[PDB]
Ligand binder design. Structure first.
Ligand SMILES: [N-]=[N+]=NC[C@H]1O[C@@H](n2cnc3c(N)ncnc32)[C@H](O)[C@@H]1O
Length: 340
């Protein structure tokens, strides 16, 4: 039973020569040598069974990643756990080993325009598949974009993912939300539960802005500060866009604000490709019904050297109340195919 940083990392004998990488949501992430496939892999240790919420996100991630098969979405290669529910205290998810992620990369590396274009293409190609399965990722951000040494990009962490539900998207003003603050669309704070595909496009727009300058475009320090930042750049919403917000508390909040002018993208990003900024503007559109969709974004002139719909595949088969005991049982069943 191998140990890393003083805790159990129980993956042998197939996987040996372990190296710590970092901290996942429910445990440690290590690299290891796959003695069968003769390559180093990543292994995530996950310990969710004490908490219903952890079990939920774990079941979501396993179920979605096992059903998806796409070049720009991380796969699950193997799942290691004990042979019985009684003995299962942890689960290990084995994935392709990716050199870095976009969050780590952006801390020290300036991206060429060619890299930004290629990364954005791969993000949207993966997202097209996700959305085509009627799934919302709901936590897209640089740290959930993995990169290998040849800059192949794979979306990961579907722990907050949901099936799209636009008929039930409406909610009140300042309704609490889980996903990462800096990448939250303005409507989350106003009247949206994040059950439509436009929630993900907003996050991608934030990611594009961040690739252009190595800094988050909207770094709110708390829930309502996030909306301040968004409106400080987009300016005041139009009457038409306000008229789409029927909730009085949210609409009157916006009406209470002094007028703010839009900040031109090319003043924020004077080095950027003008076509990139045109696409950025369409992803960071205030009104979620006017916001560009993933297939339109792929067809945008900025991505012309990569766009090819026949090489941008969709899913064959599109897709909170359960106690942790049933969820542990479902996780055990979902991982059985890798036993042996
Ligand atoms: N998840 N997570 N975060 C903890 C660390 O694990 C890293 N990580 C997650 N999945 C992989 C992966 N598949 N390959 C390499 N590193 C990975 C991620 O970049 C963080 O530095």
């Amino acid at each position: 039973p191998e140990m890393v940083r003083g805790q159990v990392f129980d993956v042998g004998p197939r996987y040996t020569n372990l190296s710590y990488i970092g901290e996942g949501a429910y445990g440690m992430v290590c690299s290891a040598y796959d003695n069968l496939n003769k390559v180093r892999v990543a292994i995530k240790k996950i310990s969710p069974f004490e908490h219903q919420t952890y079990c939920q996100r774990t079941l979501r991630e396993i179920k979605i990643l096992l059903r998806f098969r796409h070049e720009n979405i991380i796969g699950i290669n193997d799942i290691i756990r004990a042979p019985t529910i009684e003995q299962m205290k942890d689960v290990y998810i084995v994935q392709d080993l990716m050199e870095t992620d976009l969050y780590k990369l952006l801390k020290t590396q300036h991206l060429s325009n060619d890299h930004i274009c290629y990364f954005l293409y791969q993000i949207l190609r993966g997202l097209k598949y996700i959305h085509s399965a009627n799934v919302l990722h709901r936590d897209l951000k640089p740290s959930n974009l993995l990169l290998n040494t040849t800059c192949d990009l794979k979306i990961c962490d579907f722990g907050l993912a949901r099936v799209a539900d636009p008929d039930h998207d409406h909610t009140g003003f300042l309704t609490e939300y889980v996903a990462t603050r800096w990448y939250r669309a303005p409507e989350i704070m106003l009247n949206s539960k994040g059950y439509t595909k436009s929630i993900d496009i907003w996050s991608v727009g934030c990611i594009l802005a961040e690739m252009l300058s190595n800094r988050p475009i909207f770094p709110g320090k708390h829930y309502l500060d996030q909306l301040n930042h968004i409106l400080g750049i987009l300016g005041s919403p139009s009457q038409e866009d306000l008229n789409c917000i029927i909730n009085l508390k949210a609409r009157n909040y916006l009406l209470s604000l002094p007028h703010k002018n839009k900040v031109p993208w090319n003043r924020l990003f004077p080095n950027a490709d003008s076509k990139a900024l045109d696409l950025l503007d369409k992803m960071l559109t205030f009104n979620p019904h006017k916001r560009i969709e993933v297939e339109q974004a792929l067809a945008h002139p900025y991505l012309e050297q990569y766009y090819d719909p026949s090489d941008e595949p969709i899913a064959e088969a599109p897709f909170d109340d359960l106690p942790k005991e049933k969820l542990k049982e479902l996780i055990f069943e979902e991982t059985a195919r890798f036993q042996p």
